[PDB]
Design an enzyme around this catalytic site. Structure first.
Site, PDB file in Angstrom:
ATOM      1  N   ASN A  14     -13.210   5.674   3.080  1.00 20.97           N
ATOM      2  CA  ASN A  14     -13.837   4.837   2.059  1.00 20.97           C
ATOM      3  C   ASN A  14     -15.148   4.209   2.520  1.00 20.97           C
ATOM      4  OD1 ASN A  14     -11.430   5.248   0.549  1.00 20.97           O
ATOM      5  ND2 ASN A  14     -10.518   3.507   1.617  1.00 20.97           N
ATOM      6  N   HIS A  63       0.819  -1.214   0.000  1.00 22.12           N
ATOM      7  CA  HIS A  63       0.000   0.000   0.000  1.00 22.12           C
ATOM      8  C   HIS A  63       0.855   1.267   0.000  1.00 22.12           C
ATOM      9  CE1 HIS A  63      -2.688   3.027   1.987  1.00 22.12           C
ATOM     10  NE2 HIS A  63      -3.649   2.434   1.303  1.00 22.12           N
TER      11      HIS A  63
END
Ligand SMILES: CN(C)c1cccc(C(=O)NN)c1
Length: 279
Positions: free
Chosen positions: A161, A69
């Site tokens: 998110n 990530h």
């Protein structure tokens, strides 16, 4: 300068319309700026970083990015092929473990670390921090992000998110930093992007190709992907002398493409990061 067949997000930030394929940018490319990627680490050995990336701090047993990530986010800031600011200096601060998780105490320590460590680095065009992370509301986490910004660093943070109001997430909800939502290649708010009055700006966040660990690449989606587009854009504009760490988020909003995104709830800015580059 022009990069043909660029990832859609790079092309998008240099265009007033969706659907283009060339990323146009000034050749200075963020040279002389520095971006701290506060995440799972950075695989600095990746050829795409060209020796411009280095780990400077880890809160775990190793400085290695065992997740990917952080390497992906760093690639969107400043890798050769996938980056907004292709000549910036990247500094990795590993506050997240190899599963992508981290305690707020560690994330706070990492922010305080950057505020100090930048006083020891040559970054003549200024300093940016990209925070593609967060969790539920925490005044302590927000205060750490505010301190980092106050210390003279352009702080860009992911909105989150959960398809929800970012007021309930941190550091997203800290007003004094630059809170970044996500859009897709058709100029829609990404299905997962948080929204709300605290957002400052949107950036490309759905299906973003970038670097990955093992010398690889992949496409993933998130406000984690939109955030480094804005951090890289800030570094690029600071190198050009157009803005400063304290003013870059506002400058990006000032110069954004306005009103072009769909499914923006009333009360959320309709602003998409744009470099305004004119050859
Ligand atoms: C991986 N996830 C869900 C993620 C990514 C980036 C940011 C956040 C957050 O909660 N911000 N306040 C969450």
């Amino acid at each position: 300068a022009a990069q043909t067949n660029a990832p859609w997000g790079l092309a998008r930030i240099s265009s007033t319309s969706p659907g283009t394929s060339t990323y146009y940018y000034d050749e200075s490319a963020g040279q002389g700026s520095c971006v701290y990627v506060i995440d799972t680490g950075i695989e600095a050995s990746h050829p795409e970083f060209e020796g411009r990336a280095q780990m400077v701090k880890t809160y775990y047993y190793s400085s290695r990015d065992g997740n990917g990530h952080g390497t992906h986010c760093a690639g969107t800031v400043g890798s050769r092929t996938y980056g907004v600011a292709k000549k910036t200096q990247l500094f990795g601060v590993k506050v997240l473990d190899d599963n992508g998780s981290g305690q707020y105490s560690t994330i706070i320590a990492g922010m305080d670390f950057v505020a100090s460590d930048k006083n020891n680095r040559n970054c003549p065009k200024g300093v940016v921090a990209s925070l593609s992370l967060g969790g539920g509301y925490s005044s302590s986490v927000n205060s750490a992000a505010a301190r980092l910004q106050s210390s003279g660093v352009m702080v860009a943070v992911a909105a989150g998110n959960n398809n929800a109001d970012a007021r309930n997430y941190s550091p997203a909800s800290e007003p004094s930093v630059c809170t970044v939502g996500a859009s897709d290649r058709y100029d829609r708010r990404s299905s997962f992007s948080n929204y709300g009055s605290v957002l400052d700006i949107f950036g490309p966040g759905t299906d973003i190709l970038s670097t990955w660990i093992g010398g690889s690449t992949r496409s993933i989606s998130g406000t984690s992907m939109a955030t480094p587009h804005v951090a890289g854009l800030a570094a690029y504009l600071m190198t050009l002398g157009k803005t400063t760490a304290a003013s870059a988020c506002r400058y990006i909003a000032d110069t954004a493409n306005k009103g072009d995104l769909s499914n923006i709830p009333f009360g959320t800015v309709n602003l998409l990061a744009y470099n305004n580059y004119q050859a």
